[PDB]
Amino acid sequence: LKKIAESFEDPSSIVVVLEFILFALFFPTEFNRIKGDIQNVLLLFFSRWY
Amino acid sequence: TVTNEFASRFRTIVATLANVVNERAVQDDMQKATRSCTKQWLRHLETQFD
């Protein structure tokens, strides 16, 4: 997955999170192979808000 | 370490120091836009330290 590096701070930065939820419902085959690093960029999201 | 420790200690400083700032915008009871614009600055200041 082409690294999209950003830090979640503003409540408006939900667009980066919603981008994967939308991608996962179109290409399950492709998502099932790169779910790995798409996870750790989203694991950074869970450290900040929760 | 996954997430740097030295910077995570700084987050505790901002977390409780910002709480003290609110107690002044209740006595001078500024319009939320004023109290928000200072709480927003501490987000940028802290994320730079990372």
Method: cryo-EM
Dig out the tokens for B37 from the structure: 């614009």
Q: For residue B22, what is the enclosing H or E element?
A: helix B5-22
Residue type at B8 in one-letter notation? S
Residue A46, Cβ density class (10 Å: 0-12 exposed, 13-18 middle, ≥19 buried) = exposed
Longest CA–CA span in chain A (Å) reads 32
Residue A24, Cβ density class (10 Å: 0-12 exposed, 13-18 middle, ≥19 buried) = middle
Write b or e for each residue in B6-38: b if 16 or more Cβ atoms lie within 10 A of its Cβ, otherwise e.
Answer: eeeeeeeebeeeeeeeeeebeeeeeeeeebeee
- How far away is chain A from the Cα of B23, in angstroms, using its nearest Cα? 23
Name which of A47, A45, A29, B50 is nearest A19 in CA terms: A45
Whether chain B has a CB inside 8 Å of the CB on A46: the answer is no
Contact between chains at A47 and B3 (C-beta distance less than 8 A)? yes
